[PDB]
Amino acid sequence: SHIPFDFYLCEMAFPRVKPAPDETSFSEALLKRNQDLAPNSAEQASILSLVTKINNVIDNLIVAPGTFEVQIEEVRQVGSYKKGTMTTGHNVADLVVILKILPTLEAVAALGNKVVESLRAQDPSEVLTMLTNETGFEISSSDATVKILITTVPPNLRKLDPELHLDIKVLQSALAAIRHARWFEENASQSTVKVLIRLLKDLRIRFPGFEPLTPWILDLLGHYAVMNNPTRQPLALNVAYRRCLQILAAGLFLPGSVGITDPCESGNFRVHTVMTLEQQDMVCYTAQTLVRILSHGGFRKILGQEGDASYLASEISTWDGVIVTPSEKAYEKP
Amino acid sequence: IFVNDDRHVMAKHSSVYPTQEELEAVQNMVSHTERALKAVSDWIDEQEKRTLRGVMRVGLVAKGLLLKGDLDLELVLLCKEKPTTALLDKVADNLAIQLTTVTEDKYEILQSVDDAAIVIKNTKEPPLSLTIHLTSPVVREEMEKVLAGETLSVNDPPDVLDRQKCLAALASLRHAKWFQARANGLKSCVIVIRVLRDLCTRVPTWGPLRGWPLELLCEKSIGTANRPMGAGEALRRVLECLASGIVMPDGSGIYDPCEKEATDAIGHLDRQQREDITQSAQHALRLAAFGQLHKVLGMDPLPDYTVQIPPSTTYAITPMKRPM
């Protein structure tokens, strides 16, 4: 029930004595990094192409299944492709397919085969591969992959049997992905939010202290940082990026904190509680170190523009004479 | 929320709160001094028939921030005109006489023209030491006019007291009034300042915050919460504020509400000091979150607090109170 300190929630209470330093270079670096990370045109075209073809086939199966046994209630585009937060080099889109029937491994394989064969019938020259997996199946071209996350209608969930049916965890996560995509389209369809999330994804890769943060937590964190603020305008990217580090450092995701309530669940689920206490400590202490590094002008290292920087979170570093000691673990096993 | 943390903060608070013996000794000496000074004032006035415009408590005595071990008390003596060496000597001399109208306790009276002050020491061991700062609202006006490019027209005694010292004294007076108006009635604020004051003593990294910057930091950070907080949560919020980087060189700093020219109450910290304090609060925050606040407080794990001495009956002031 405790809401940790966030400077950007009460700026009027902390007036600046002197203007903030000029962050033109940081702002430029953030955009350059976003541009580096953003999918190129070829990637954008190949994923659009594959998603469209698959989504068309599935749409058709929905209206005109005919003899086909695996009946489909609905298909939705979800995830990074739908949110506009994809990263270059990972050209994968997700579709959620809600079956009317019980999702058996067998039905999933039949649907996967059915969809890819429809594509091959329409265009024999395009080489695709279709493999089933834990969550449904996936179809790949040489250039792009579309994952079909299978789930089912509500009746069937409380009606599930672990015996022959895809795991409940998988069916629920696919349903959550639809909720997330809907929430995102309505609440986080702002340029700066999508860019910040792409940058956070990258930050997490380069500083594995952030590994416990999940994609949904990053979505919510990016949205919070840009949008949740009394200027009633999206915060500028350089400001929101710093804010992400500050609020983590100030313990947004620590024990005692309300953190961020999941807007796609009932009733008031604190999203960060998917992390263990130890992981909460680590995410916090990693942000705490980076907060300080950023203050000493380490933005290029933080942004990944000066090679590996991961050691900044674990080793002492020096910045124009100032010695920075990384924040260290506080959590203790019971 | 944070029941265990409340317990530890309050236990720590008890450990640092002055004994009744210390508080009685402070009350005694402050009251004697205030009464003696009023007598000095009356005597000057009669010898004229104004010169001394009143005596104000500042610092730890005013704010209720005395802790076990504090020997230093402070008052501000307000003069109608800029105070002079002549007035300082006059006051110091007559004080020795007027004191005998209220007590037989022996007091050493030392004037310090350079400090624009009179220091009084009792004979207890260790002795309490009360500094009487002489100043006038006129010293600020003159300084302000100069900064505003105005020319001073003042037939000045050749011995006006150091304007810098006298300006600092008005500043401490501003702080005391601000403290009573804003910090005192802010739930948990005084308690947290007392505890963090002790922390600043125990942990040299925090030393540079001791006093006004810490008071401001605590009131601001605690006051920005959307609801009253118990001591455990309130302390945590101060830690979160610091952990967020608020005192780092590119942070907003802590705007001094008692200065007309925009002033950072922590602007005196160098880069390494800011770095160290930030890192320390960051670690303390996580210690608190993970059940180890006792380590921050320098204590072993456990198995209206604001008024320390009565307000002056000699120089009674109108009590301002932070709005409900």
From Swiss-Prot, chain A:
Pfam families: DZF_C (PF20965), DZF_N (PF07528). The keyword Transferase does not apply. It is found in: Nucleus, Nucleolus; Cytoplasm; Nucleus. Ubiquitinated at Lys-18 by CRBN with polyubiquitin chains by the CUL4-RING E3 ligase (CRL4-CRBN) and then degraded by the proteasome. The keyword DNA-binding applies. Keywords: Activator, Cytoplasm, DNA-binding, Isopeptide bond, Methylation, Nucleus, Phosphoprotein, Transcription, Transcription regulation, Ubl conjugation. PROSITE patterns: DZF (PS51703). GO terms for molecular function: DNA binding; double-stranded RNA binding. Its main location: nucleus. The modification Phosphoserine is found at residues 25, 41. GO terms for biological process: positive regulation of DNA-templated transcription. Signal peptide: none annotated. There is a cross-link at residue 159 (Glycyl lysine isopeptide (Lys-Gly) (interchain with G-Cter in SUMO2)). Residues 2-334 form the DZF domain. It comes from the Eukaryota. One of its GO terms (cellular component) is nucleolus. There is a cross-link at residue 18 (Glycyl lysine isopeptide (Lys-Gly) (interchain with G-Cter in ubiquitin)). Expressed in brain, kidney and ovary; highly expressed in testis, particularly within pachytene cells. Forms heterodimers with ILF3. ILF2-ILF3 heterodimers may also bind to PRKDC/XRCC7: this may stabilize the interaction of PRKDC/XRCC7 and the heterodimeric complex of G22P1/KU70 and XRCC5/KU80. Forms a complex with ILF3, YLPM1, KHDRBS1, RBMX, NCOA5 and PPP1CA. Identified in a IGF2BP1-dependent mRNP granule complex containing untranslated mRNAs. Interacts with IGF2BP1. Interacts with CRBN; this interaction promotes ubiquitination and subsequent degradation of ILF2. Chromatin-interacting protein that forms a stable heterodimer with interleukin enhancer-binding factor 3/ILF3 and plays a role in several biological processes including transcription, innate immunity or cell growth. Essential for the efficient reshuttling of ILF3 (isoform 1 and isoform 2) into the nucleus. Together with ILF3, forms an RNA-binding complex that is required for mitotic progression and cytokinesis by regulating the expression of a cluster of mitotic genes. Mechanistically, competes with STAU1/STAU2-mediated mRNA decay. This is Interleukin enhancer-binding factor 2. It comes from Mus musculus. The lineage of its organism: Eukaryota, Metazoa, Chordata, Craniata, Vertebrata.
Swiss-Prot record, chain B:
It is found in: Nucleus, Nucleolus; Cytoplasm; Nucleus. It comes from the Eukaryota. The modification Phosphoserine is found at residue 153. This is Interleukin enhancer-binding factor 3. The modification Phosphothreonine is found at residues 151, 278. It comes from Mus musculus. The modification N6-acetyllysine is found at residue 63. The gene is Ilf3. Residues 1-324 form the DZF domain. Identified in a IGF2BP1-dependent mRNP granule complex containing untranslated mRNAs. Interacts with FUS and SMN. Interacts (via C-terminus) with PRMT1. Forms a complex with ILF2. Can also bind to PRKDC/XRCC7: this may stabilize the interaction of PRKDC/XRCC7 and the heterodimeric complex of XRCC6/KU70 and XRCC5/KU80. Forms a heteromeric complex with ZNF346 and ILF3. Found in a nuclear export complex with XPO5, ILF3, Ran and double-stranded RNA or double-stranded minihelix VA1 RNA. Found in a nuclear export complex with XPO5, RAN, ILF3, ZNF346 and double-stranded RNA. Transmembrane segments: none annotated. There is a cross-link at residue 260 (Glycyl lysine isopeptide (Lys-Gly) (interchain with G-Cter in ubiquitin)). RNA-binding protein that plays an essential role in the biogenesis of circular RNAs (circRNAs) which are produced by back-splicing circularization of pre-mRNAs. Within the nucleus, promotes circRNAs processing by stabilizing the regulatory elements residing in the flanking introns of the circularized exons. Plays thereby a role in the back-splicing of a subset of circRNAs. As a consequence, participates in a wide range of transcriptional and post-transcriptional processes. Binds to poly-U elements and AU-rich elements (AREs) in the 3'-UTR of target mRNAs. The chain holds residues 6 to 374 of 898 of the full protein. Ubiquitous. Expressed at high levels in the thymus, testis, ovary and at lower levelss in the spleen. Phosphorylated at Thr-151 and Thr-278 by PKR in response to RNA viruses. This phosphorylation results in the dissociation of ILF2 from the ILF2-ILF3 complex resulting in a cytoplasmic sequestration of ILF3 where it can bind to viral RNAs and impede viral replication.
